[PDB]
Structures are given as C-alpha cells and as structure tokens.
Design a protein around this ligand. Structure first.
Ligand SMILES: Cc1cc2nc3c(=O)[nH]c(=O)nc-3n(C[C@H](O)[C@H](O)[C@H](O)COP(=O)(O)OP(=O)(O)OC[C@H]3O[C@@H](n4cnc5c(N)ncnc54)[C@H](O)[C@@H]3O)c2cc1C
Ligand SMILES: Cc1cc2nc3c(=O)[nH]c(=O)nc-3n(C[C@H](O)[C@H](O)[C@H](O)COP(=O)(O)OP(=O)(O)OC[C@H]3O[C@@H](n4cnc5c(N)ncnc54)[C@H](O)[C@@H]3O)c2cc1C
Ligand SMILES: C/C=C\C=N/CCCC/N=C/C=C/C
Ligand SMILES: C/C=C\C=N\CCCC/N=C\C=C\C
Lengths: 496, 497
C-alpha cells in the first residue's frame, strides 16, 4: 500500500519525507510516537511567552553545515533573521576566586590549548582512558611548566567539554573528547521554524502522530510490514527507521515490553547488535532561568562556573611520583551541589535580548535535576549559589525568588527570577537521553557503518547516530534523512 | 701531507655542534668543526646592549615544547640544578590599530574568534587534499572574507585580515609573498623563551674535544676523491682529507654552489658538482627574512598586562565596501588596486614586552621581509630607525597607560636608551633568516635531497634538511644528530670480526 514508511518525525524523518515528496514519490507515511513532530528539536514556551529550544539550539560547523547553509540562503533572500552567531569570549567563574578567564597570571585558556594539543599527540590510539585520566596525565607530565593555580584551576576549566558530550569527565572517552569544530556556531532563532518549514514540505496526510511502532517485519515477498501499538498494520516497499539509538538499542534486548522498543523479524543482523557494545548515549540536559529583566553586565553570552577545586589537589600533583601513586593519592573520601560539576550558562540577554539564562548540564547531574523538575522550590535552592556568584561577577546582586510573584518596588536593580524550566530527555521513553556519546573504549565508526549499510535493501536507518559528518548533530540527522530518501528515490525512478 | 680526519663538520651552528657532540658521544675520534665566523652558534647569537642587558638576536624560543627534544634536555637540566634556562612567555595577545587602539579581546569585534575560523577555513582548504593549487596567504584570506561576508561584520572584515598577518612573523615573509599551503602549521604546545640560547650553544660546544673547533676557517671547496675520500680546502690554505663531511651551511649559502663565481664569501665549490636533484630543489624552496629590533628603555613605566603585543598595519573602510560589493573572486582581485611610502604602519609588527616575562625594560620586535631587508640596510642609522618606529612605539605606550617615548640614545616618561638591529640578510654566512615557502614551493624536495646526501661521504645537516622542526633550532639540532648517528653506525662496522 505504501511506497515508503518513515518511522519517527524528528529532523531525520522529516527531511526524508520532504525529500521523497520533492522527488515525485507518492503514497508515503511518517509514523511518530509523540503527539508532535520535531523529536529532540523542541521549542517550548515560558514566562511572558518567551521561547526556548529545550533540545537542540545551535547550528554547529557553520562552514560546512548544509542545513545551516540552506538557512543562510533563505535569510539572504528574505532578509529575515533565522539565527545569530553567538560565539563569545568565555567568562569562567570559580566560587571562591570569582572570574578567572583571560587572566594575565593564570592564562588558563593557553594551557587549555596545550592540553588539547597534548590529547591529539596522545592518540596519533593505544588504549583509551577517561577524559579525567588524560587530564591527570597531562598535569603530571607537565607540572614543571605549570604554576600552582594553573594545576588547580585548569582541570576544572577544561571540563566545559563535559557540556559538549553530556558526560562527566570520569565517564567520557578520552579518545573522542576532542573533536574539530568546523567553524563558528550559530544559535538557531527557532529550530521549530526549521522543523515547521521542513514538516510542511510534504503531504500533511502523510503524518501519523501517537503511532508507537511496535514491530517491523521483512515479508519474504518484497514488502515490509509495520505495526503500530494500537493495532493498525501497514505494508511498504521501503522503510526508514529514525528512532534514536538508545531506543533502537531496546530491540537487541529481551523482554519486548519497553516503551518504544521495536520488534524486528528477522532480528537486526549481528553487525548492528555488536555496534551497540561500542556506542552508548549521553545526557545533555537544560535548565532555563527566566528573570523579570536584565540588570547585569552583558559582556559575554557565554559563562561557565567551575566545580570547586582545592590547594591540596595541587600539593598531591606536585608530590606524586607516578601515575599510579597519583591515582590512589587522589582517592580521598558527599552530596552533590551546584559546585560539584561545571555548568554552562548562555546569557541570552546579549545574544537575543531576552532576560533569561539557558544552562547546560551533564550526566549524572542531568538525570537527578530532571527527576525533580516539578519541584521549583528545590530547583531554585539547588542553583541559587551559582546564580548568585554569576550575578555578583556580572555587577549585580543576589537573585530574588519571584517564582510565586509578589510585586515589590524594592526590587529596583535586583535580579528577579520568575520561572524555571527543565528538560526531561532522560525520562522521556522516546528519547532516553540526549544524543550518542562515547564511554572509554567506544568506537563510533561501528554504528555509522552498520546503520548506513542498513538492515537490508528495504530496511534503512537515519538519525544523528547514522552518519559521520555531523554525527550526534541536527544537521547530521537532517543529512542522514536526505541520504535514505534520495537512495530510495533513485531506486523507485529506475523501476521506470 | 693533508691531515686525515674521520669526520669534518662544516659550520659551528647548532646542527654542526650537535653533530660533533654526537660523534664524540659515540666514541668517534679525530674529527673537526670548521667555522667561517669567529664565534660558534650561527643563527643562535646572544648580543649585549645597554647596561650589559642580553638579547638573542637570532633564535629566541624553544618551539613545540611538548615534543621538542632539545627543550626536553634543557628542562631536565633545570629540573636538577634549579637554574633558570627559559621561561614560558606565551600570553594573551594585545592588538593595536593606529586609529582605533586596542582591538583585542573586544566584546563586539571578537577578532580572535573569527581568526580561529579563518585558520579552520584554511585547514579545510588544503588539509589532506590532492591537486589543490597553492596561492598566497593574502589570497587565501581574501577568499575566506568573500565566502563568509554574510557572517562577518564590517569591522571584522576590515580588521581581521590585519590581525591574521601576525603569521608573517612566524615565516619572516609578507602575506603576498607567502605560500598559503605552508602558512598554517600546528604548534606542539607552548613556547619557552630561552634565557640565553648562547648557554645552550656553549653546553653543546663543550661536550666534545675542544681542539676540534676551528673558528675563522672558511671552507672554499669540497672534492670527492674517487678513492673513497673527501678533500676539504680552507681559505687559509690548509687542506684536509676526511672519510666523511657533514655540511651544515645555510640553505642560502649552499645555493651559491650552483652558480658561477667562486669568490663569494661562504660559497663552496663542489667536485663533482652537487647532483641535479639538489640543484633543482633550490627552485622549489626559498628563504625568508625574519628580523629583529631591540628597543632598550631606561626603566619600565608602562603596563605589564601582557608580554605579547602586535601592531596591525593600517586598514580602510573602502576595503570593506569592496569585499561587500565584489561579485566573485575574480572581481575582488580586480577592484583591489589603485594609485605609497613604507612606514611602520604598512605591515604588522610583533613586540615582545620583556618587562613582564624577564623584568628587563626592553621590547624585542620581530619584522618580516621586505621590511627586514630595508631595516637592516639602515641598521647603522639609529636616528633614522627611531624616527621610523616612533609612531608605533608611541601608540604602544599610549595603549599601555604611558606617554610618548623620549629619545635618550645620546620620571614618568619612557626613555629609549639604545636600539639594536639584526644583520642576517647582510651577513654573508647567513644571507637571510631561514627556509621559507613562496606560493608553489615544495619544501619536501629539499629535505629529501639533503637527507639523502650528495653521496655516501658528503652529507648535509641544518634547519633546511629535515621535516620535523623544519626551520627551527631543534630541527637543526636533530639533523646534526641524524648525520652523526648514521656515520657512527657505518664506522662501527670497522670493529667487527
Ligand atoms: C539538550 C540537547 C541539546 C542539543 N543541542 C544541539 C545543538 O545545539 N546542536 C545540534 O546540532 N544538535 C543538538 N542536539 C542533538 C540534536 O537534537 C539531535 O542530533 C537530532 O535532533 C536527532 O534527530 P533525529 O531525527 O535522529 O531524532 P529525533 O528525536 O531527534 O527522534 C526520532 C523520532 O523517533 C520517534 N520515535 C521513537 N520511538 C518510536 C516508535 N517506537 N514509534 C514511532 N516513533 C518513534 C521519536 O518520538 C522522535 O520524534 C541536542 C540534543 C539535546 C538532548
Ligand atoms: C631573526 C631570527 C629569529 C629566529 N627565531 C627562532 C626561534 O625563536 N626558534 C627557533 O627554533 N628557531 C628560530 N630561528 C631559526 C634558528 O636560528 C635556525 O633554525 C638554526 O639556528 C639554524 O641552525 P643551523 O645549524 O642549520 O645553521 P647556523 O647558521 O644556523 O649556520 C651553520 C654555520 O655555517 C657557517 N658557515 C657558512 N658557510 C661556511 C663556510 N663556507 N665555511 C665554514 N663555515 C661556514 C655559518 O657561519 C654558521 O655558523 C630564528 C632565525 C632568525 C634569523
Ligand atoms: C555548546 C555546547 C553544546 C552544544 N550542543 C552540543 C550538541 C551535540 C554536539 N555533538 C556532540 C556529540 C557528542 C558525542
Ligand atoms: C616566535 C615568533 C616568530 C618566529 N619564531 C621563529 C620560528 C622559526 C620556525 N618557523 C617555522 C618554520 C620555519 C621553516
């Protein structure tokens, strides 16, 4: 009955569909489990109707990013604003010392650069370790050329990379930690606008929401059969599975009952199954802090508070005689606070004019914070200390809790918090995390190869976890969507 | 009659000194280091100036400290005796435009950020690409601007190309003369400023038999006697016969060998003549002219915020309008033309504020060709030099919370006490700074011809004969270790049963 059935209406699924229509292919479907399209691209609304991408927010690698370039064209043609280049000089804040960025004496950014260079040389990749292990090796080998404060603060500064992978430094693969940024980043002014434009480019009656596909079977007759949970069954010539990696991973697990899990028959070939042993998922999370208005310096749109550090750490590094001795010596034995991990804050006031902070968090904090997302009081109590330090470093004062408003003129030039928004990607069965990430010992290529090769001729895969360029990214998934559709598109046309 | 030696090293620069050090280390005896100049070190030279202040007028930094073998040795020494042999002086760059003033770490210009994109653009332009035409650095930057105009502000288009040019001071070549392919090269970590490169030269110089060193003997000719021997002639009339010779003279000096006219200082007459692969390699690699000017002041009465200061050459809003209106690369190249004297604002200049890194009240400035050749051609005219640089010096002082400079060469104001200039483009034993690439050059050719040698007995060492550390002091150092090791290996067969 159907030419192509696309499972998942995230950017990958949406582009594929868009591509099929664009190539004259008819009778296609887009089966999405959620009651909306967009997938991990979701723009939510908060205080005074302000909007925020709770999922993806930036166009990365703007030099080669095809999706971005496409958006660039549109903006060049209609003069409308679709994005803003918000890269900025990073402001680094330590609870005790305050700002430590661009410091004439700490020069942290410079040794951070040597650090990355150090990592590159290390894997040019005899045995992988965690990012934490690599930073410790660097400090030990280079301590002769590092001051005390550099040894203390640099390791905390370099962990901003945790916010790129969504994983604590002790959980992150050192080999995959440092990747090349192909140019500046462009903050999307509505990834929902990207979703809508693509979504509207194909037959609206093609979309089926709330269709949780439960099983996919390759009928030995040149036809694929798809069954959504409710009971509706379909048959198509080609199927493009774009469900996230974490969801697809349920398939290779026993006890088919998990929300989202699809039953493949025959099962996914071994090359696919094994791929999951060297892939894994990350948990980038988001907390939005909405204030009445801006009353703090807009020197930069990029701010990072560093986890607390100690002088005893420096002493231990200075005295350690070798890697092992350093390791155990570091073993020094609770309760997580906003200062237990680095936190990345986007000061939307400078880049968008909106008096709000978009904060990024990583596992294990993410899971914990998203778990208490309904408890605004606790949320404020948890982040209040880093929020106050930031305001102090930005020439302002302590934040006023106005989540339960009480108009008070006393709040002259005081920052007044009106709302807090939290992501929920780790508890959403259809996402179960943020995007593919590497634990030490992983090999991302495996999954790319297997996914791109597909289960077979009719069973294809798309998604941010199915491509090399832009892997884990919106544009990566977008392109993976075009890939599968164009391939199927050429195949149907050749049937002449 | 002509004395017999196992190995004769021509040149007591770092390659040659290391060669000798290695030979002795491996037990080779009866060797010789013949140096034309009356001192050792070559392009490693530390001079004295006002009040006995010391400055390296040639090489100054240990580059690529994460892997630099020469730096690691020095570091092992300091780690043991606690003596200070170097200082990590990397810092946040201060950028100064004549009209605008400081444009570094600017919340709106964000030049540093787009500069990073620029180098990435360059990387994507050549990185692992076969069949790509070269073009000049200047042209690469123009292309970037054109293709990214939509994502750059006017001020970024105006100032960015001028900041990018600090790379001219890494190559000693003006951006229009420089090969874009070879412009960007990775740095293996931070740089360490040597506090007496001459102390590095002396240690290596003292690590071998002191009677080996013959200064003031310029070598005139090298002859391969088809009897497995090499005859070497010093101009002082002495003749030597050696089983092996390691030639470490500068690439610019060796180039003289492929031309007629023997009475040129430094030129070596080769018989038989240098193989065609060597002669022809001189067409695929050239020589840059990094130069120096040391400005010594009475005392420090300026901000020590940073030790790294770069003055940007003048730029115009007209350029921006031209990038904006250009229809394509071909049009841009065209429009860019008009109808002129060279001043201190005609090219970027790099100033090391030694007051913060060493505590010495002096600026060490780097300059590039063609400016270097002109400035050295007037090194003797101190009043003229001061007038030429006075404006960039004044602007720097202004930006560092101080006042115009007072000529004190003959309480709150900076007083210039002395000006020192390099002489590399004029010294016939250097004839330039170091090997560099012109658009279309292929450095690999020379390295291959050099490391392979003229033949089994006639070898080459020097910054121009090796890949890792090419053009650098440690590259020259390693090249010397290379040839000496090879020779030790071969001479070792002598003791076999
Ligand atoms: C907090 C956060 C921030 C991010 N920031 C950025 C950024 O700045 N830049 C960037 O490039 N990327 C970013 N990303 C990653 C980016 O969002 C993803 O790469 C991209 O959206 C993945 O697209 P997709 O089409 O593969 O899947 P979409 O989620 O991403 O999901 C595929 C679809 O499958 C559906 N589905 C699942 N199971 C079933 C089923 N059984 N039946 C039917 N449908 C099903 C889902 O509901 C979903 O709509 C971020 C991610 C997170 C979590
Ligand atoms: C201004 C300037 C700044 C620099 N800064 C740095 C820096 O910061 N870091 C870095 O790593 N490098 C730097 N360099 C480069 C570095 O100095 C050289 O790579 C290195 O010193 C070259 O060593 P060499 O042994 O090959 O030659 P040395 O010049 O470099 O020359 C070999 C020797 O041959 C002798 N000779 C020549 N002809 C004859 C002859 N006919 N008979 C006998 N002897 C002869 C010469 O007098 C000389 O002593 C700089 C160079 C210049 C010019
Ligand atoms: C600026 C900080 C985070 C921006 N978003 C990052 C999105 C994911 C980029 N690719 C990550 C891949 C991880 C394996
Ligand atoms: C340190 C600032 C400028 C120049 N330093 C000297 C660099 C010498 C090596 N340059 C790189 C490659 C040369 C062939």
């Amino acid at each position: 009955k159907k030419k192509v059935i696309i499972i998942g209406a995230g950017i990958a699924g949406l582009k594929a569909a868009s591509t099929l229509h664009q190539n004259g292919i008819q009778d296609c479907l887009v089966l999405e489990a959620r009651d909306r399209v967009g997938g991990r691209l979701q723009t939510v609304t908060g205080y005074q109707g302000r909007k925020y991408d709770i999922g993806a927010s930036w166009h990365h690698d703007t030099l080669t990013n095809p999706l971005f370039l496409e958006e660039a064209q549109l903006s060049l043609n209609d003069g409308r604003t679709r994005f803003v280049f918000d890269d900025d000089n990073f402001i680094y804040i330590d609870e005790e010392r305050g700002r430590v960025d661009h410091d004439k004496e700490l020069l942290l950014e410079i040794v951070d650069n040597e650090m990355s260079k150090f990592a590159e040389l290390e894997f040019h990749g005899v045995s992988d370790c965690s990012f934490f292990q690599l930073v410790m090796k660097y400090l030990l080998q280079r301590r002769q050329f590092l001051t005390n404060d550099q040894i203390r603060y640099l390791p905390q500064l370099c962990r901003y990379l945790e916010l790129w992978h969504g994983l604590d430094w002790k959980l992150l693969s050192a080999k995959d930690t440092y990747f090349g940024h192909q140019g500046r980043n462009a903050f999307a002014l509505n990834y929902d606008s990207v979703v809508q434009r693509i979504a509207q480019s194909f037959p609206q009656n093609w979309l089926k929401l709330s269709c949780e596909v439960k099983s996919i079977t390759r009928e030995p007759s040149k036809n694929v059969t798809v069954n959504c949970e409710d009971g509706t069954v379909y048959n198509a010539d080609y199927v493009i599975i774009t469900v996230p990696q974490s969801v697809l991973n349920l398939s290779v697990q026993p006890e088919k009952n998990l929300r989202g899990r699809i039953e493949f028959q025959p099962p996914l070939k071994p090359v696919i199954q094994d791929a999951f042993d060297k892939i894994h998922f990350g948990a980038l999370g988001k907390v939005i802090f909405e204030f009445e208005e801006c009353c703090w310096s807009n020197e930069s749109s990029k701010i990072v508070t560093l986890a607390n550090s100690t002088n005893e750490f420096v002493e231990i590094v200075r005295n350690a005689e070798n890697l092992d001795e350093l390791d155990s010596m570091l073993e020094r034995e609770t309760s997580v606070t906003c200062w237990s991990q680095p936190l990345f804050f986007v000061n939307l006031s400078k880049s968008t004019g909106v008096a709000s902070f978009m904060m990024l968090m990583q596992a294990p904090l993410t899971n914990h914070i998203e778990s208490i997302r309904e408890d605004k009081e606790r949320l404020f109590s948890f982040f209040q200390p880093v929020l106050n330090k930031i305001m102090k470093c930005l020439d302002s004062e302590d934040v006023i809790d106005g989540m339960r408003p009480i108009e008070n003129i006393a709040n002259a030039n005081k920052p007044v918090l009106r709302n807090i928004i939290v992501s929920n990607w780790t508890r959403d069965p259809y996402s179960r995390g943020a995007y593919s990430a590497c634990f030490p010992g992983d090999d991302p290529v495996d999954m790319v190869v297997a996914m791109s090769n597909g289960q077979d001729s009719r069973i294809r895969f798309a998604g941010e976890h199915t491509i090399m360029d832009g892997a884990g990214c919106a544009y990566g998934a977008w392109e993976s969507g075009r890939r599968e559709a164009t391939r199927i598109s050429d195949l149907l046309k050749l049937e002449h």
